Amino acid sequence: SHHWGYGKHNGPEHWHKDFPIAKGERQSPVDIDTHTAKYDPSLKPLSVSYDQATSLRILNNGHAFNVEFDDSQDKAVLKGGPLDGTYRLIQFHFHWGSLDGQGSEHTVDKKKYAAELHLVHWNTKYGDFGKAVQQPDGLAVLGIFLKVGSAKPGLQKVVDVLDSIKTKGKSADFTNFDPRGLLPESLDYWTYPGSLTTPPLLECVTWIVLKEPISVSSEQVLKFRKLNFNGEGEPEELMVDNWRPAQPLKNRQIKASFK
Ligand SMILES: NS(=O)(=O)c1ccc(NC(=O)CN2C(=O)NC3(CCCC3)C2=O)cc1
Ligand SMILES: NS(=O)(=O)c1ccc(NC(=O)CN2C(=O)NC3(CCCC3)C2=O)cc1
Ligand SMILES: [Zn+2]
C-alpha cells in the first residue's frame, strides 16, 4: 500500500523507488526563472468561471486537506490561456511549511513562499478524473502563492473548520464555500507542462501559476500547521512541510501571459 509522505524516511527523495516517473521528463514543481520565461502572444485569455461552484466536503487525507466540489456537471470551470477545451474544478488544497520562509512547491527566482494553493481541474473531454490523469492534457492546476501579511477574509471559513479535521481520515461538511475569495486581483500567470506533485506523480498537468500572491495572516497559516499527518489516537506528527522541492526543468519552456 501507499506509505509515501514528507518525512526523512518516506519523503520526496524516496518516492522514485515506488514511482519511477519521479525522475521523468516533465515533473513538477519547478523553479520559475522570471528573466528566462517569455511572453507568449499565442496564449488566449484565461477564464476562471467559479460563479456556480458547489463545494461539498473538506477531508484531511494525511498529506493535506482537500476542499471537494460537485464535479458531476460544469459548475466551476477553467478555460482559455494555454488550455484547449473545458476543465472542471474537482478540489483545492494547499502545501505549506513549518516556517513562513518555506512551504511553496513552485519557486520564483528560487524564492519560496509560505504556502501554495492548488485548484485542481480535469479535462471534461476524458469524462472522469481517473481517465483524465492518464492523458498528457488531462488536468489543469491553477497555482496561487501565499505570503504572510494581512488576513485573507475568503480563507477564514477554511481555517475555522480545520479544528474538526485535525487527523488523517477525518472529513466535515463544507458546503456553500466560494473559492473566488482565494484569488488575487491579477490573473497574470506562467504556464508549463508538468505533473502531479505527489505520488503517483503522473505527467498529466498543464500548470498555470499566478504571478500575484495572496496575503494570509500569520494566525491563518499557524492554524494550517496545527493539522496532523497521523490518524486519531496516534502519536502527533504536525502536518507541516508537505511540499515537494523544485524538479529539473529538462526540455521545457515556461511561458508568461504578460508582457
Ligand atoms: N518509495 S516511497 O513510496 O516513498 C516509500 C517509502 C517508505 C516506505 N516504507 C516506510 O519506511 C514507511 N513506512 C513504514 O515503514 N511504516 C509506516 C509507518 C506506519 C505505517 C507504515 C511507514 O510510513 C514505503 C514506501
Ligand atoms: N499537488 S497537485 O499536483 O495539485 C495534485 C493534485 C491531485 C492529486 N491527486 C488526486 O487528486 C488523487 N486522486 C485520484 O487519483 N483519484 C481521486 C479520488 C477519486 C477522484 C480523485 C484522487 O483524489 C495529487 C496531486
Ligand atoms: Zn498540490
UniProtKB/Swiss-Prot annotation:
Disease field: Osteopetrosis, autosomal recessive 3: A rare genetic disease characterized by abnormally dense bone, due to defective resorption of immature bone. Osteopetrosis occurs in two forms: a severe autosomal recessive form occurring in utero, infancy, or childhood, and a benign autosomal dominant form occurring in adolescence or adulthood. Recessive osteopetrosis commonly manifests in early infancy with macrocephaly, feeding difficulties, evolving blindness and deafness, bone marrow failure, severe anemia, and hepatosplenomegaly.
Stated name of the protein: Carbonic anhydrase 2
Record note on what altering H63A does: Reduced CO(2) hydrase activity, rescued by 4-methylimidazole (4-MI). Reduced proton transfer. Enhanced proton transfer. Enhanced proton transfer capacity
Residues where N-acetylserine occurs? Answer: S1
Effect of changing N61T: reported as: Reduced activity
Consequence of changing T197 to S/V: Reduced activity
Function field: Catalyzes the reversible hydration of carbon dioxide. Can also hydrate cyanamide to urea. Stimulates the chloride-bicarbonate exchange activity of SLC26A6. Essential for bone resorption and osteoclast differentiation. Involved in the regulation of fluid secretion into the anterior chamber of the eye. Contributes to intracellular pH regulation in the duodenal upper villous epithelium during proton-coupled peptide absorption.
Hey, which family's this protein in? Belongs to the alpha-carbonic anhydrase family.
Question: What EC designation does it have?
Answer: 4.2.1.1, 4.2.1.69
Indicate which residues the UniProt annotation says bind substrate: T197, T198
* Molecular-function GO terms, alphabetical: arylesterase activity; carbonate dehydratase activity; cyanamide hydratase activity; zinc ion binding
What does the UniProt record report as the effect of altering N61H in this chain?
Reduced proton transfer
Q: What is the lineage of its organism?
A: Eukaryota, Metazoa, Chordata, Craniata, Vertebrata
